[PDB]
Design a protein around this ligand. Sequence first.
Ligand SMILES: NC(=O)C1=CN([C@@H]2O[C@H](COP(=O)(O)OP(=O)(O)OC[C@H]3O[C@@H](n4cnc5c(N)ncnc54)[C@H](OP(=O)(O)O)[C@@H]3O)[C@@H](O)[C@H]2O)C=CC1
Ligand SMILES: *P(=O)(O)OCC(C)(C)[C@H](O)C(=O)NCCC(=O)NCCSC(=O)CCCCCCCCCCCCC
Ligand code: SF4
Ligand code: SF4
Lengths: 115, 82, 441, 185, 130, 337, 133
Amino acid sequence: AVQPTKFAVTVRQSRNWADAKQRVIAAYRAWIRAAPEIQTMYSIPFPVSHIRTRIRQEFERHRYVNKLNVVDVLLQQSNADFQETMNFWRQQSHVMAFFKELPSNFITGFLEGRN
Amino acid sequence: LQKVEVYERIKSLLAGFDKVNDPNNITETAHFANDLGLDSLDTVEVVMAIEEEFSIEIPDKDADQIHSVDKAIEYILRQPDA
Amino acid sequence: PQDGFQGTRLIPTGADFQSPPDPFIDEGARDNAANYGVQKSRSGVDEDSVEGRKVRHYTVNFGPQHPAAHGVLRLILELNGEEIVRADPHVGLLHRGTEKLCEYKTYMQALPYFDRLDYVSMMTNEQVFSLAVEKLLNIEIPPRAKFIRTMFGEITRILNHLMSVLSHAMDVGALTPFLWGFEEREKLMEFYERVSGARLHAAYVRPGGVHQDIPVGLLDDIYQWATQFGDRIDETEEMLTDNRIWINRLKGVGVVSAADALNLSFTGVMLRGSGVPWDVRKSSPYDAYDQVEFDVPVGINGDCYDRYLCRMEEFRQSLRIIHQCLNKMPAGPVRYEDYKITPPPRAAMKENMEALIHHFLLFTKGYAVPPGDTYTAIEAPKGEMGVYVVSDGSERPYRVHIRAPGFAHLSGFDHITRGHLLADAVAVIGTMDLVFGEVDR
Amino acid sequence: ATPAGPPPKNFRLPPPKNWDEESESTIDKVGKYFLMTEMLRGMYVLLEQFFRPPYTIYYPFEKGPISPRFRGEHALRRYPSGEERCIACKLCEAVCPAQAITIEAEERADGSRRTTRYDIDMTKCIYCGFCQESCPVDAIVESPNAEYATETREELLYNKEKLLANGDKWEPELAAAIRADAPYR
Amino acid sequence: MSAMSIYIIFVSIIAILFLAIDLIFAPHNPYKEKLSAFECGFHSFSQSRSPFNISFFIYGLVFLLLDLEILLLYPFAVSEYVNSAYGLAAALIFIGIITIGFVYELGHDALKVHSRQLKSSVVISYLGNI
Amino acid sequence: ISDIHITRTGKPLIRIQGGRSSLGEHTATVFGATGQLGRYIVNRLARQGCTVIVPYREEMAKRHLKVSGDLGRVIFMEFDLRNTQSIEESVRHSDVVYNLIGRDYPTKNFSLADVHIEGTERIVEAVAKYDVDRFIQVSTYNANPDSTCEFFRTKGIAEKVARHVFPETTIVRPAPMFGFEDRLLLKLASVTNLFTSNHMREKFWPVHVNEVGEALERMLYDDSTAGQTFELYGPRQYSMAQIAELVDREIYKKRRHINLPKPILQPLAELINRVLWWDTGLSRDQVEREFHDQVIDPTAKTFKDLGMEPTDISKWTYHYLLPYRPSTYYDLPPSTE
Amino acid sequence: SYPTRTLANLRKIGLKEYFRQLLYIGDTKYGELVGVDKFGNKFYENKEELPLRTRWVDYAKHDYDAAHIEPMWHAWISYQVDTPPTREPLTQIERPWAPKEHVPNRSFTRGAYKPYNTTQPKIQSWEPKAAPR
Ligand SMILES: NC(=O)C1=CN([C@@H]2O[C@H](COP(=O)(O)OP(=O)(O)OC[C@H]3O[C@@H](n4cnc5c(N)ncnc54)[C@H](OP(=O)(O)O)[C@@H]3O)[C@@H](O)[C@H]2O)C=CC1
Ligand SMILES: *P(=O)(O)OCC(C)(C)[C@H](O)C(=O)NCCC(=O)NCCSC(=O)CCCCCCCCCCCCC
Ligand code: SF4
Ligand code: SF4
């Protein structure tokens, strides 16, 4: 067959919640380990602290998931997004599209038009 | 390396972390979760910070074992890099 | 669905049903020379899984802005010196959502999309879509349309091979045959622009026959071109077949075995190069093919040279088919004689009520295709081109999926190229005859 | 691989020929190797091309051939009296595969069904001819004109004023193309 | 002054005059993306300043010594009338030894770059039933 | 800020906010937009769906601006300063006129007085003639009719001419600007800028050009900014020596300069400017500014009056100077020293 | 061109025309006049020429452009008809609304076409009428 690429990971299902628990930590660790390496690959002018902050928030939005089959789709997406980033397939515009650098009240929203 | 040397730098880093509940609770036998108030992701960041400071790579199998300051000290002595 | 929330039985996987080979008769650790130490992990010390994730081979972006890329391919090559250890083709740079756009079109409105997939083989792409809708319509297109579609089907095959074979020779360094053959294709686009109004995107072959009838001078001019096209094939035959630089750039290059070529979803010359006798026009005759005689070129070594010899033979077989179509062209309509499907003549639409109502409904609502699904495949100039069309029973397709030969071929690139040099990759892109309108869709 | 049933007759290749079984003479084989013989033939074939007429035409003084069915830029056409042929049925707006046509109609001052808006986005069009195919009255046509390249994209947004002006200028060919191509439609 | 000395000057002033024109009468507007490496439109790893395998360096070593060998044959070419037979013999003895080392390089496949991308030997026999 | 803007002439503007396909309702004219600042104001106005007239001189140098806006949004008019008709044709459909026309050095057909005083005179007289709502003229820092530097004097007299003709002028005084294609950071990283009269010790409060284009956008929406005077300067004071120190730390090159005595350099600089056709950075007055120092004139509104807090030049050195790092040090992270 | 043809054409047209043709067509062509545009463009035919070269135009303007060819002649130069606009009846239908003058491609000039809305706005706002208190 054709060779899987450098960070290609075989798609496998989580055995139990302990499996998923350990994989999510492995994925979060691997992301924040790579933040210094992302910065010089993509010439990020922000410091690495901001990059790791964004990694933390992406993981935090899936914090309250209690379904193995939703976590494994999520562990799939991060694996592909990690592989995509580390092999430098995406470019600076894609990585900067990921950093964003709604009205806070009804009355603020009303006065400007909806938002 | 020296045990006191590989512990003094940890206290500065751990106190330097933004949102530990209080810098006094760091001891030689303190736990990140029970004492220092760090959740799963905060603890993974702490091992990540420790590895960067000591310029060593902490593997997935023994990275999980570091849930307390003493475990970090023993691993740092065990691994031959500084 | 609900059970997946918590842990349940794991879905069985191909790794589970693996079986151990029998040790009495097993001979060798590698019956394939594709994996015979010409891939990654043949050098260094440690594998690239642990402690090797910190280093890279020499990695070069071969395309998109590259001549040998022939367009819009991003082929990420890992080079060990000047040798390829891993090839990762990155596609989707001409992905324009054709298959989603077809779902907001009537069946007529979607036909010009097929002109733009393999965009050197327009009328052949039109045919596979016209034959799938005609099958779901349960109609039988008239004999004159079937002979026009087979004749322009082989005019299209020659047009593709002129672009394919001579682009491939240009990549290897031979410039002059490209220039000669592009006068012939420039000749053949007159035949397109005389029956349709376009040199390239004819929109000619449609479900129910063809759009208009051929003009009264076309068959004589096609025959006049046919009396000299043999000489054109021979003079390009005269610069490459025996050339010793041509032979040593293609013989033994891009070798795929017969049993692996089927397993790789290879079709067309990519399959026939490996020794398999297989032609979709021989095995599932469509249009007027079962009414003509032609031979099927089949190679024996499965390399770039045999694939070149098979394609240069198809020039001669296409010209042979074209002559029989000129001779056997029948009279009669070129559109199925049902105005509920095909548009009525403008004369009838301006003269009679039921012709006007049908013209009005066919161009606003479209015709309704009876519900169902189908896979329809034809021998496209680049291989088995297929379409999977799902029908609602309404006037818009529920699903149009295009099976593109070059999508299946570019996927087997790393299988046949890993271990060759950088020039040999250029050789394999051209023998595999890629157009990224069909690859990306 | 091969068809099911009896295997093809003589499908199995003959056994390989040895070096001393090839029936070519050494003088010929060595001569061809050292004299570069097959490539001298290719050199010669280029020579006789060198003494053949070229294929080149001198554009724009000479133009390549186009047919009555040729699809170029759009034009709106009129009857012999100067009345617009367009009646606002909207059929071409419906059939367009690229949604390049936007039409607004009303009853005209004299009660006539005529368009108020008629736009073709010439950067959305696919030049398929489906709009002229569907016209009930031969209003929208594609001219034989291909040379209308512009400096800006705003110049490619044709309104009714631009399209009628195109028909008013190109009517003699539009009529001669329809005359020559009508019986086949 | 000699033709050679002026010839060197004129070719250098031409190399300067052409260069000076472009350095003066052409627009110069350098920006970040204009000044990037060409990689067919995608930025990749910068790894052209790291060690790179050369699969033909054994050619470079043998090229080094066969140059010394053909240079040592050029004084003979311009001295044949005096070398004559006795001098010819030494020149042939020298070229024969040099040629033996060349047969060593052809024989061992030292001038061969290996690249591409063996039949069954298991015969089964049937005795039938026990 | 709202969906309704009401202008000084009283016309309402019912806006749809986002994107280049929407309705910003404002018709602007930006004189001097093909320079360095001009793109940032034009991109800001155009990408929010406003019609922008771009008076230009050389056709090929205006082309990057069309990408900013949708079809029919950015309208190019070919004009000259001494062509009053082309000036009047360019501002008469407009509700705001930006005057960004300036030049550091004299030219064979424009003195500093001719491009600043007379150019502003024609532009403002057309603003008065067709009753355009807003007029944001951009002067310089240290502008003073009593100045002796031709730059700071002539841009100080045009300030008074504009107010005398159109009193509702928003006068904007930026400090020396840094950014992409800036004549501040890119010259200190260059190799032509070797001559110098002072020891690069003159001080100023450098301001991001990106934050100045944003400031000019906000003056259009904050109608109360009319008739005001704005000094737009940065958060810190630096010398040319402190800025050049940052550049060397970033490009890793350690640039050097040749200092000259002003009675010697200034005459030469007036010769290079008179004998070369391109912007050489050297001229008699640019040497005179070289010896002058920036003063933030009080009673002048600031970035805070637009509700904006400018960022320091140090945070921007990596982004803009990285093209000038040598290959050996290019892959390194930002200095952040 | 080839020596037999070029000298034969050069003999027929004269040296002065030979150099004019080397300036615009860059070829040496001889043929008989078939007609003249409303724009002054001159059209020749010679069936004794290479295919697609038997018809050509001598452009009236120095700054010659392909869009300077009148519509009916645009079909003749394109081999879309064989009868020239001199002998073609459709060039006789009187249309008082037809352009009397020559209307070429107007891009890159100030006569370039500017598009616009041909329709009125879709919603009309109230004109306020503050009745006296
Ligand atoms: N950038 C800075 O450091 C500072 C800038 N300023 C002022 O800010 C404004 C914008 O700055 P910036 O964009 O950097 O300046 P630039 O010099 O880059 O741009 C000046 C603009 O003025 C135009 N212009 C100059 N002279 C004439 C003339 N005689 N006739 C017509 N147009 C002319 C130029 O058009 P063209 O390109 O066609 O010549 C150009 O678009 C200027 O007025 C400047 O003096 C003040 C303080 C600091
Ligand atoms: P502790 O017991 O508190 O354990 C914490 C965790 C998070 C494990 C939770 O308790 C938990 O089990 N929750 C459910 C699992 C979960 O949080 N999410 C599933 C993991 S996949 C995921 O979250 C993917 C996030 C996005 C992709 C990765 C982030 C990086 C994106 C790109 C970064 C920058 C690139 C340019
Ligand atoms: S189809 Fe023809 S007649 Fe009908 S609205 Fe369209 S252009 Fe007018
Ligand atoms: S030819 Fe153009 S305008 Fe007519 S239907 Fe096709 S895309 Fe639409």
